[PDB]
Each structure stands twice: as C-alpha cells, then as structure tokens.
Amino acid sequence: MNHFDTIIIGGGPAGMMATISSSFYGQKTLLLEKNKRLGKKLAGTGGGRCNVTNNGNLDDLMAGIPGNGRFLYSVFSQFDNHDIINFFTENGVKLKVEDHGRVFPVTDKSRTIIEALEKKIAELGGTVITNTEIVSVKKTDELFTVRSSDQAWTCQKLIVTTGGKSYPSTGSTGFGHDIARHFKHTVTDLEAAESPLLTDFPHKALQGISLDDVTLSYGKHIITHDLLFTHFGLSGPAALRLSSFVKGGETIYLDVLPQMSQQDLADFLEEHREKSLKNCLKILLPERIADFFTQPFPEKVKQLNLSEKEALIKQIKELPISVTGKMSLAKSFVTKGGVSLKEINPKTLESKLVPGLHFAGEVLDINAHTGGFNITSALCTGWVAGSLHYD
Ligand SMILES: Cc1cc2nc3c(=O)[nH]c(=O)nc-3n(C[C@H](O)[C@H](O)[C@H](O)COP(=O)(O)OP(=O)(O)OC[C@H]3O[C@@H](n4cnc5c(N)ncnc54)[C@H](O)[C@@H]3O)c2cc1C
C-alpha cells in the first residue's frame, strides 16, 4: 500500500516533528529521507552534542530569530520551545541548559535526541523510509504523487521539510525549493548567514580559545557574545552574528573586557603593581590571551611606564582584526532565504497556492541565530504543519 494520508519529505527536525504530530492527529503518515540516517544535520549542531532548543522567554526567542521571526506568532501560540522541552522530558529524555539558554541532552549525544523522535514516530504508527531520494512531486486533482527514481507514493497532504542550502553534504541541497517553484511559489534570493569569519591574523597563537560575552565592533554594529578563535579566523556567536555585516577587507574591533572601562583597567593595574603583568591578568583573561597582549612588555606591572600601560589597555579594549572574507553559503550554518512567507498561511503552514501542500523548517524564508533557535523554528513549524486544524 503506497498511499498515505500525509507524506513528509526530509527527515530533519521539521520532518520528524511533522511526522509525530501528523500521526498524533490520526493521519496515516509516511516520512521519506534521502540519507540512511534521520537528522544528519541536527546531529552535528552544538559541536555534535545537539542543541535541540533554547529555553528563553518570548523576548529571547524573537531576538534569536531576526529573519522573519514575527511570522511565527501563530506557530508559537500552538507549539513553542517550552513544548519542545516538555516533549522530551515527558518521553524520558533528560535535558540541561548551558550558556545563553542553550538546551542539550544531558548525555551530550545527538542520538539521544534522534532516537527519542524515532521511537515516538514508531509508537504512533508512522512509517519512515530512509535512503530514498525523492526526485519528483506532482499533484493531480487532489492527490500528490511522490517519486524516487524507483517508486511512487501518493497522499492527500504533503509536507516539505527538506532544509536550506548550507552544508549540502548533510542532505540539504535545495529540493524543497524545486518543489516550491514547480508549484509556482516564489523562492527568495538565497544567501549565507551565520558564517565563520576568515581573518589575516596569527591564528596559531590563539586557536581553540573561547571567550565569553566579548564585544566585536564594525561601524555601528556592536555585538556582545561568545567568540571562538579558530585555525582560519573567528567563529562562535559574536563572529557568526557580525558576519551579516562584513564580507572581506574590513577592520573589525575586539574588546575582550567589555565590563571594564579603560579607567577600571588602569586601577586594576595600579592595585597589582608588584605583580607579574601576565600573571595578575589571569583572573580577567585566559592565560594564552594574557600571553598575547603582554609578550612585548616588561615583566612586572610596576616596570611599565605610563605610555606602555595606556597602550596595553587600548589593545585589550580595542584589538584591530583584519577580516579577509567569510564562509560561503555551503560552509555556513544557516541559509538566509527560502519559500516566500507571503504565500504561506502562518497558522497552518499550508500553501496559499495549492491545497494540501505545506512547508516547515529551514526550507521556509525564516532564519535564526545558532544557539537552538533554528532548530526551535524547525521543530515548531514541523509540529504545526503536521497538525490538523478544526473550524
Ligand atoms: C554546523 C552546523 C551547526 C548548527 N548549529 C545550530 C545551533 O546551534 N542552533 C540552531 O538553532 N541551529 C543550528 N544549525 C542549523 C540547523 O541545524 C538547521 O537550521 C535545521 O536543522 C533545519 O532543520 P530542517 O528540518 O528544516 O532541515 P534539515 O535538518 O536540513 O533536514 C532536511 C532533511 O531533508 C532531507 N532531504 C533533502 N532533500 C531530500 C530529497 N530529495 N529526498 C528525501 N529527503 C531529502 C535531507 O537529507 C535532510 O535530512 C546548525 C547548522 C549547521 C550546518
């Protein structure tokens, strides 16, 4: 029997969640996935630990989804980040919160998240067929026909959850945009968002250092968040966020101690005048950062003259960094752009052009910061798309 009430294409978080709600509402539901495994992209989020959502309040959630977050009022009125947390804990998955509201499985293993979702799908009678690339979708009368190279499936309701365009090696290569265009939907310009930065800097001096809530400035863009020094440049939220405003050739500025004024730092130094400059700074900064700034100066605080102190303080508060480029769309964490939201019903995620056609997840023209916000949108829009609505 190749006929289902609801067919979902793409088994990332949107598709898995859509399969669960579709089954929960009593639809006979089929999830088709290109890869052998579900949630291949999802599994690599949060350094492989799976940043499944964010525990913030409404203000935090909206701030975390700056690419059309407003569209989600109705979705979030039906299923939100607290429902995601509840769902996992109610199915015996223990969750924890880390910095900036980031939620993870306590196990620190993505398979904990993915297996719980599969288990729920099975328990609700959903069917999943993996290792099956869908290559065609068409609608005739009131039936969608979904085809691989090899087989055909039909349904009354189709949900497209095939992702965006970044990290195409995980399986997100744009098929959902093709389906959209086939049904005469507008797909907006697609472009990199949340892109690690390439810099011209001595990377080995600092690589692997993470800094908490430091400030990166370029023009009027001042971003305060965590920063990661990498072998090629900068990553972590502060760099990812600023990457929306730089593309190469710019000088950006780093303030490693945003909570201390230049005067506070001058007082700190005066109160530690008998000390080694590098050692006394360890209470404020990681040792490798203290090494970087203090290397060319005299060893003890009191051995610095006034010029040296002022020079050092300005370096700590305003380090110039030369940005040479940013990762391509393929090498970025999020796709900015997707199916035009004007053509989508925000309450149901149904196409305004073709009845029974739905989109959820990053295939839509919604983009968010890393830290759980894209996964939240995908899970929540998935849930809602899979739900039935009565009136
Ligand atoms: C390295 C990295 C780190 C990230 N970290 C974070 C983070 O910390 N917080 C956060 O919120 N977001 C993060 N993201 C983004 C987040 O992972 C995605 O936005 C989210 O997974 C989108 O979910 P989705 O279900 O819309 O699409 P995806 O998870 O991309 O799933 C789409 C699925 O559709 C399948 N598919 C595509 N075409 C076909 C076809 N023709 N037939 C069958 N199946 C198909 C694909 O194989 C894929 O499994 C990160 C992304 C990357 C790449």
Q: Which of 285, 304, 328 marks a domain boundary?
A: 328
| Residue type, position 34, single letter | K
**Ligand 1 contact, 361 CB (< 6 A):** yes
Residue of the CA atom closest to atom 47 of ligand 1: 171
User: Is residue 33 marked as binding?
Assistant: yes
Tokens of 126: 């959903």
Report whether 151 contacts 137 (CB < 8 A).
no
Helix crossing, 287-294 with 306-317: angle to 10°? Answer: 130
| Rounded-to-integer distance, Cα 35 and Cα 125, Å | 21
- Are 306 and 187 contained in the same domain? no
Domain count, the chain: 2
User: Is residue 134 marked as binding?
Assistant: yes
- Are 126 and 258 contained in the same domain? no
Of 45, 151, 334, 364, the one to substitute when testing ligand 1's pocket (max ligand atoms within 8 A of C-beta) is 45
Instruction: Count the Cβ atoms, other than its own, within 10 Å of residue 95.
Output: 19
| Residue type, position 316, single letter | I
Report whether 188 contacts 365 (CB < 8 A).
yes
- Are 41 and 179 contained in the same domain? yes
- Are 9 and 96 contained in the same domain? yes
Give, as one character, the DSSP assignment of residue 107.
T
- Are 198 and 313 contained in the same domain? yes
- Are 2 and 93 contained in the same domain? yes
User: Is residue 344 marked as binding?
Assistant: no
User: Is residue 374 marked as binding?
Assistant: yes
- Are 228 and 324 contained in the same domain? yes
| Rounded-to-integer distance, Cα 244 and Cα 239, Å | 9
Tokens of 206: 């600092």
- Are 73 and 218 contained in the same domain? no
Report whether 305 contacts 277 (CB < 8 A).
no
| Rounded-to-integer distance, Cα 376 and Cα 12, Å | 12
User: Is residue 308 marked as binding?
Assistant: no
| Residue type, position 140, single letter | T
- Are 221 and 307 contained in the same domain? yes
Tokens of 43: 């599994």
**Ligand 1 contact, 178 CB (< 6 A):** no
Report whether 210 contacts 226 (CB < 8 A).
yes
User: Is residue 270 marked as binding?
Assistant: no
Centroid of ligand 1 to alpha carbon of 388 (angstroms): 24
Report whether 278 contacts 285 (CB < 8 A).
no
**Ligand 1 contact, 46 CB (< 6 A):** yes
Which residues in 114-244 belong to E strands, given as ranges?
Answer: 127-129, 136-140, 143-147, 152-160, 191-193, 197-200, 210-218, 221-229, 233-235
**Ligand 1 contact, 69 CB (< 6 A):** no
Tokens of 332: 């970025």
Q: Which of 328, 359, 381 marks a domain boundary?
A: 328
Residue of the CA atom closest to atom 30 of ligand 1: 163
Beta bridge partners of 200: 322
Beta bridge partners of 4: 155
**Ligand 1 contact, 128 CB (< 6 A):** no
The residues, any chain, with a CB within 8 Å of residue 65's CB and separated by 6 or more, are 72, 366, 367, 368, 369, 373, 376, 377
| Residue type, position 255, single letter | D
φ, ψ of residue 160 in degrees (nearest 5): -100, 115
Give, as one character, the DSSP assignment of residue 2.
-
Report whether 299 contacts 277 (CB < 8 A).
yes
Task: Describe the strand order of the beta sheet including 102-105 as a list of residue ranges.
Answer: 53-54, 102-105, 95-97
3-state helix, strand, coil in the chain (%, to 5): 35, 25, 40
Q: Which of 328, 346, 375 marks a domain boundary?
A: 328
- Are 155 and 112 contained in the same domain? yes
| Rounded-to-integer distance, Cα 118 and Cα 16, Å | 8
Give, as one character, the DSSP assignment of residue 367.
B
Give the closest residue to 135 by CA, choosing from 233, 9, 13. Answer: 9
- CATH number, domain at 102? 3.50.50.60
**Ligand 1 contact, 167 CB (< 6 A):** yes
The residues, any chain, with a CB within 8 Å of residue 145's CB and separated by 6 or more, are 136, 137, 138, 139, 152, 153, 154
Range of the domain at 381: 1-193+329-391
CA-332 nearest atom, ligand 1: 53
The C-alpha angle 277, 280, 284, rounded to 5 degrees, equals 115
**Ligand 1 contact, 362 CB (< 6 A):** yes
| Rounded-to-integer distance, Cα 375 and Cα 95, Å | 15
- Are 18 and 145 contained in the same domain? yes
Please report where in the chains the tokens 């890869």 appear, as a residue.
Answer: 35
The C-alpha angle 198, 201, 203, rounded to 5 degrees, equals 85
- Are 297 and 174 contained in the same domain? no
Centroid of ligand 1 to alpha carbon of 126 (angstroms): 21
Q: If residue 9 lies in a helix (H) or strand (E), which one and from where to where?
A: strand 3-9
Instruction: Count the Cβ atoms, other than its own, within 10 Å of residue 66.
Output: 16
Q: If residue 336 lies in a helix (H) or strand (E), which one and from where to where?
A: strand 334-336
CA-360 nearest atom, ligand 1: 26
Look at the alpha carbons of 112, 115, 121, 122 in this order and tell me if their dihedral is positive or negative: negative
